[PDB]
Amino acid sequence: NLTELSQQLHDASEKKQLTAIAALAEMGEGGQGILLDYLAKNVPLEKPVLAVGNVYQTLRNLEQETITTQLQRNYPTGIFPLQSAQGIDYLPLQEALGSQDFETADEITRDKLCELAGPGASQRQWLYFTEVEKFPALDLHTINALWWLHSNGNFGFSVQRRLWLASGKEFTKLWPKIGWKSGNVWTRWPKGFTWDLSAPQGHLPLLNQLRGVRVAESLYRHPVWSQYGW
């Protein structure tokens, strides 16, 4: 029933929205038209809204010519403002995430964090924890919003942070939870990682532990998360 499923999407229960979206996407032109109209009334986002990301990404994932064309024409930069306190271009990150190319998105995210830190980090291609502490909140918000909106809330530094808090801030308990260690075995980069949504919650983006936890801790303690309600 398209009428009842559209009503379910326009009601306020997020869990019932998500089931309606999945059902509508499998109902051809009528269901997909309801989803496209929903996007049109809710994009561009101001605050990240998981349902809106799920609608967009569900439609992208159909990989049908006309819907893909319509989405690219109407939302050429995606559904979320690509804002940067340093004028950085986040469209390549958005494009990788919209394609569900999470490995590429992980690589781009690492490159952008170095670019955000400055020439020293870009030259050495890794970060000092103090550079992380001084990141502008706006860029971290954009980066995280993209990861979260294009992963049904499963990926993002905000997701890792809340799992870390749930672990009593014990990093040795966090790694197994997000799939970065299995018992004694560190997950080998890149081939050991799971570059798709079957991965555990918080699996991406990656934070190499070769130089210790200081960068990750500085990132999870950064004021962006409380400031933007993550």
Ligand X SMILES: C=CC1=C(C)/C(=C/c2[nH]c(/C=C3N=C(/C=C4\NC(=O)[C@H](C)\C4=C\C)C(C)=C\3CCC(=O)O)c(CCC(=O)O)c2C)NC1=O
**Residues forming a β-bridge with 179:** none
Q: How far is the CB of 223 from ligand X (least distance, A)?
A: 24
Given 187, 218, 220, 222, the residue binding ligand X (CB under 6 A): 187
Residues of span 140-179 touching ligand X by CB under 6 A: 175
3-state SS of 94-134 is: HHHHHCCCHHHHHHHHHHHHHHHHCHHHHHHCCCCHHHHHC
Q: Which is nearer to ligand X, 126 or 195 (CB)?
A: 126
Residue 126 as a binder of ligand X (CB under 6 A): the answer is yes
Which partner in Cl ion, ligand X, none is near 180 (CB below 5 to 8 A by kind)? ligand X
Cβ 126 to ligand X shortest distance, Å: 5
Does position 126 bind Cl ion by CB under 5 A? no
| Rg of the chain, C-alpha, whole Å | 18
3 state SS of 21: helix
Contact 145, 157 (CB under 8 A): no
Indicate the angle between helix axes 102-117 and 91-98, nearest 10 degrees. 160
DSSP code of residue 185: E
Structure tokens at 74: 């109407």
| Interface positions, 204-223, toward Cl ion (CB under 5 A) | 214
Residue 209 beta carbon to Cl ion: minimum distance, rounded to whole angstroms: 11
Partner from ligand X, Cl ion, none contacting 171, C-beta within 5 to 8 A by type: none
Residues that bind Cl ion (CB under 5 A): 128-129, 214
Residues that bind ligand X (CB under 6 A): 126, 175, 180-181, 186-187, 189, 206-210
